[PDB]
Design a protein around this motif. Structure first.
Motif, PDB file in Angstrom:
ATOM      1  N   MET A  23      30.059 108.557  -3.181  1.00 26.20           N
ATOM      2  CA  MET A  23      29.973 109.489  -1.374  1.00 26.20           C
ATOM      3  C   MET A  23      30.753 108.918  -0.478  1.00 26.20           C
ATOM      4  O   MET A  23      31.353 109.617   0.103  1.00 26.20           O
ATOM      5  CB  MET A  23      28.736 108.637  -1.148  1.00 26.20           C
ATOM      6  CG  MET A  23      27.655 109.192  -2.135  1.00 26.20           C
ATOM      7  SD  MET A  23      27.408 111.452  -2.623  1.00 26.20           S
ATOM      8  CE  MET A  23      25.922 111.212  -4.230  1.00 26.20           C
ATOM      9  N   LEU A  40      37.599 113.560   1.101  1.00 24.04           N
ATOM     10  CA  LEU A  40      35.974 113.856   0.063  1.00 24.04           C
ATOM     11  C   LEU A  40      37.065 113.846  -1.005  1.00 24.04           C
ATOM     12  O   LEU A  40      36.771 115.475  -1.622  1.00 24.04           O
ATOM     13  CB  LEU A  40      35.149 114.855   0.813  1.00 24.04           C
ATOM     14  CG  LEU A  40      34.455 114.684   1.205  1.00 24.04           C
ATOM     15  CD1 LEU A  40      33.422 115.245   2.265  1.00 24.04           C
ATOM     16  CD2 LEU A  40      34.018 113.335   1.451  1.00 24.04           C
ATOM     17  N   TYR A  42      36.380 113.076  -4.335  1.00 18.89           N
ATOM     18  CA  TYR A  42      35.194 113.462  -5.256  1.00 18.89           C
ATOM     19  C   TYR A  42      34.244 114.052  -5.179  1.00 18.89           C
ATOM     20  O   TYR A  42      33.820 114.350  -6.599  1.00 18.89           O
ATOM     21  CB  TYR A  42      34.649 111.682  -5.558  1.00 18.89           C
ATOM     22  CG  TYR A  42      35.750 111.168  -6.749  1.00 18.89           C
ATOM     23  CD1 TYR A  42      36.374 111.706  -8.439  1.00 18.89           C
ATOM     24  CD2 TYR A  42      35.813 109.526  -6.505  1.00 18.89           C
ATOM     25  CE1 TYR A  42      37.216 111.134  -8.551  1.00 18.89           C
ATOM     26  CE2 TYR A  42      36.809 109.338  -7.340  1.00 18.89           C
ATOM     27  CZ  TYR A  42      37.166 109.751  -8.469  1.00 18.89           C
ATOM     28  OH  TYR A  42      37.304 109.207  -9.681  1.00 18.89           O
ATOM     29  N   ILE A  43      33.919 114.750  -3.858  1.00 23.31           N
ATOM     30  CA  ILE A  43      32.880 115.444  -3.144  1.00 23.31           C
ATOM     31  C   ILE A  43      33.400 116.816  -3.779  1.00 23.31           C
ATOM     32  O   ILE A  43      32.504 117.380  -4.478  1.00 23.31           O
ATOM     33  CB  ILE A  43      32.601 114.981  -2.133  1.00 23.31           C
ATOM     34  CG1 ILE A  43      32.351 113.700  -2.034  1.00 23.31           C
ATOM     35  CG2 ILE A  43      31.321 116.293  -1.623  1.00 23.31           C
ATOM     36  CD1 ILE A  43      31.162 113.360  -2.215  1.00 23.31           C
ATOM     37  N   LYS A  44      34.534 117.220  -3.737  1.00 26.37           N
ATOM     38  CA  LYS A  44      35.553 118.407  -3.661  1.00 26.37           C
ATOM     39  C   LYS A  44      35.925 118.851  -4.973  1.00 26.37           C
ATOM     40  O   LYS A  44      34.955 120.181  -5.593  1.00 26.37           O
ATOM     41  CB  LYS A  44      36.782 118.595  -3.173  1.00 26.37           C
ATOM     42  CG  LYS A  44      36.769 118.083  -1.323  1.00 26.37           C
ATOM     43  CD  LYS A  44      36.413 119.734  -0.966  1.00 26.37           C
ATOM     44  CE  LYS A  44      36.292 119.626   0.773  1.00 26.37           C
ATOM     45  NZ  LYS A  44      35.031 120.592   1.571  1.00 26.37           N
ATOM     46  N   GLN A  45      36.296 117.642  -5.897  1.00 25.24           N
ATOM     47  CA  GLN A  45      36.165 117.865  -7.157  1.00 25.24           C
ATOM     48  C   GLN A  45      34.721 118.363  -8.147  1.00 25.24           C
ATOM     49  O   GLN A  45      34.738 119.140  -9.189  1.00 25.24           O
ATOM     50  CB  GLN A  45      36.249 117.246  -8.198  1.00 25.24           C
ATOM     51  CG  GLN A  45      37.714 116.853  -7.591  1.00 25.24           C
ATOM     52  CD  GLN A  45      38.886 115.631  -8.331  1.00 25.24           C
ATOM     53  OE1 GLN A  45      38.790 114.956  -9.300  1.00 25.24           O
ATOM     54  NE2 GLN A  45      40.321 114.901  -7.471  1.00 25.24           N
ATOM     55  N   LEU A  46      34.116 118.172  -7.894  1.00 24.50           N
ATOM     56  CA  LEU A  46      32.261 117.619  -8.137  1.00 24.50           C
ATOM     57  C   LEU A  46      31.993 119.040  -8.317  1.00 24.50           C
ATOM     58  O   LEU A  46      30.848 119.494  -8.614  1.00 24.50           O
ATOM     59  CB  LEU A  46      31.109 115.942  -8.122  1.00 24.50           C
ATOM     60  CG  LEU A  46      31.421 115.326  -9.280  1.00 24.50           C
ATOM     61  CD1 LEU A  46      30.713 115.430 -10.484  1.00 24.50           C
ATOM     62  CD2 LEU A  46      32.801 114.799  -9.302  1.00 24.50           C
ATOM     63  N   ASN A  47      32.539 119.368  -6.945  1.00 25.00           N
ATOM     64  CA  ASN A  47      31.519 120.270  -5.808  1.00 25.00           C
ATOM     65  C   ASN A  47      31.923 121.735  -6.661  1.00 25.00           C
ATOM     66  O   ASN A  47      31.989 123.106  -6.883  1.00 25.00           O
ATOM     67  CB  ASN A  47      31.460 120.115  -4.838  1.00 25.00           C
ATOM     68  CG  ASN A  47      30.252 120.290  -4.201  1.00 25.00           C
ATOM     69  OD1 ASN A  47      29.188 119.960  -4.472  1.00 25.00           O
ATOM     70  ND2 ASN A  47      29.734 119.173  -2.889  1.00 25.00           N
ATOM     71  N   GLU A  48      33.413 121.700  -7.137  1.00 22.96           N
ATOM     72  CA  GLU A  48      33.895 122.813  -8.162  1.00 22.96           C
ATOM     73  C   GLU A  48      34.257 123.240  -9.381  1.00 22.96           C
ATOM     74  O   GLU A  48      33.223 124.023  -9.907  1.00 22.96           O
ATOM     75  CB  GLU A  48      35.632 122.697  -7.643  1.00 22.96           C
ATOM     76  CG  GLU A  48      36.637 123.517  -8.232  1.00 22.96           C
ATOM     77  CD  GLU A  48      37.855 122.435  -8.571  1.00 22.96           C
ATOM     78  OE1 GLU A  48      37.933 121.178  -8.460  1.00 22.96           O
ATOM     79  OE2 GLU A  48      38.868 123.258  -9.800  1.00 22.96           O
ATOM     80  N   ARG A  50      31.105 122.439 -10.729  1.00 20.69           N
ATOM     81  CA  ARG A  50      29.498 122.858 -11.663  1.00 20.69           C
ATOM     82  C   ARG A  50      29.906 124.243 -11.414  1.00 20.69           C
ATOM     83  O   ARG A  50      28.435 124.501 -11.891  1.00 20.69           O
ATOM     84  CB  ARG A  50      29.083 122.260 -10.655  1.00 20.69           C
ATOM     85  CG  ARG A  50      29.001 122.599  -9.129  1.00 20.69           C
ATOM     86  CD  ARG A  50      28.110 121.807  -8.090  1.00 20.69           C
ATOM     87  NE  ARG A  50      27.188 122.910  -7.534  1.00 20.69           N
ATOM     88  CZ  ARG A  50      26.576 122.551  -6.961  1.00 20.69           C
ATOM     89  NH1 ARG A  50      25.994 121.812  -6.100  1.00 20.69           N
ATOM     90  NH2 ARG A  50      24.983 123.786  -6.605  1.00 20.69           N
TER      91      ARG A  50
END
Lengths: 50, 139
Positions: A23, A40, A42-48, A50
């Motif tokens: 996070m 962010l 790791y938040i952008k890659q994980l939100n991309e 999905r």
């Protein structure tokens, strides 16, 4: 404190520090791994993905 | 099981033998049979060597029902899988749950076989240079 036989890995403590790293990580290797904008990482890659 | 090192030996030379026997250069024809268990220093050429292979020494088995990982010791060339649980918790129980093997906690060793041959001028008149087997482990 749960300890697997022959393993120094606790489940909940590694779970919490993996979540704390996931996070919050904004290019720290560019600041302290060598002497060599974003937000962010790791938040952008994980939100991309999905 | 917790052996970080590997123990090995080396004999004394003849210079320490004359200066106050155990290490003589032995032939394979000079084995006699009764030297099975003495430290021997053999001199010879090496013709056959093999590749380095991992041979297990102790087999590690893990369980999810009790958690007590067991370790069995093998000595021969072959072995059998201990599917029956021999733990300290499954003896006082009706259930005798499945066990699994671990290739990581099991201790291995770099095993290699070699064929030492008899020296040419040390063989007698008419005889042929017969061989012998040497099993090495570790470093």
């Amino acid at each position: 404190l749960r300890i697997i036989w022959g393993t120094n890995v606790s489940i909940q403590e590694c779970t919490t520090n993996f979540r704390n790293f996931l996070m919050s990580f904004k290019y720290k290797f560019r600041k302290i791994l060598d002497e060599r904008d974003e937000e962010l990482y790791y938040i952008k890659q994980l939100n991309e993905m999905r | 099981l917790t052996r970080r090192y590997f123990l090995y030996f080396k004999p004394l030379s003849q210079n320490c033998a004359r200066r106050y026997i155990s290490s003589k250069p032995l032939s394979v024809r000079q084995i006699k049979g009764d030297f099975l268990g003495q430290l021997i220093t053999v001199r010879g050429i090496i013709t056959r060597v093999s590749d380095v292979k991992p041979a297990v020494e102790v087999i590690a088995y893990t369980c999810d029902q009790c958690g007590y990982e067991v370790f069995q010791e093998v000595n021969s060339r072959t072995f059998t899988p201990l599917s029956e649980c021999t733990s300290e918790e499954c003896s006082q129980n009706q259930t005798k749950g499945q066990l699994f093997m671990s290739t990581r906690a099991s201790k291995f060793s770099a095993f290699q076989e070699c064929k030492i041959q008899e020296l040419s001028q040390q063989v007698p008149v008419g005889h042929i240079p017969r061989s012998l087997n040497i099993h090495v482990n570790g470093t």
